[PDB]
């Protein structure tokens, strides 16, 4: 205790570029959070109820490289900044948060687990302000309840003068509506 995290790198520069072009990833997948990369950007994805969710501003319309070839997005909502792919085999699927605690954590690509106070449906305040450079590349990362269940994914940072005091996220609620709609 409390909730902790660590990261493991699975691919280098060259392999990432090649896998990007082939759409074929034969690597073993593990963990609740995937670190994703495109040609130009890196960011996060969180697997919830068998779908790997991330931000449209990272992934765009792109396929995800997979064991059988490129995986087509099963959910794409541009205005909500949300996309999802069926989770590849091996990703650890998270449970949505029920209880409704307002005491949250944000897990960053650096595998830090940072206290957040939920201020509304889609917003939470960083209890200790962070430099924006620290949060960059963490979009798609999970916001968790104290139990470790997921409330949503990191979308955007509210920042001034290079410091972020709060975060906007996409609630698991928005995932179900997106699934219900399509």
């Amino acid at each position: 205790a409390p909730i902790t995290a660590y990261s493991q790198q699975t691919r280098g520069l060259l392999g990432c570029i090649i896998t990007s072009l082939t759409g074929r990833d034969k690597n073993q997948v593990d963990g609740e959070v995937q670190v994703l990369s495109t040609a130009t950007q890196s960011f996060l994805a969180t697997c919830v109820n068998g779908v790997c969710w991330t931000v449209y501003h990272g992934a765009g319309s792109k396929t995800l490289a997979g064991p059988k070839g490129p995986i087509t997005q099963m959910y794409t909502n541009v205005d909500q900044d949300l996309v999802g792919w069926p989770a590849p085999p091996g990703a650890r699927s998270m449970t949505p948060c029920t209880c409704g605690s307002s005491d949250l954590y944000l897990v960053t690509r650096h595998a830090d687990v940072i206290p957040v106070r939920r201020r509304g449906d889609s917003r939470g305040s960083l209890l200790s302000p962070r430099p924006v450079s620290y949060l960059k590349g963490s979009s798609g990362g999970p916001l968790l309840c104290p139990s470790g269940h997921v409330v949503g994914i990191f979308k955007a940072a509210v920042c001034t003068r290079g410091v972020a005091k709060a975060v906007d996220f996409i609630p698991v609620e928005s995932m179900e509506t997106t699934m219900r709609a399509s």
Binding site: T4, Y6, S7, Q8, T10, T19, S20, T54, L64, A65
Partner: peptide
């Protein structure tokens, strides 16, 4: 115009 690629993962405890 390529695919998104998994380059790493984070394991939660």
């Amino acid at each position: 115009k390529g695919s998104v690629v998994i380059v790493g993962r984070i394991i939660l405890s």
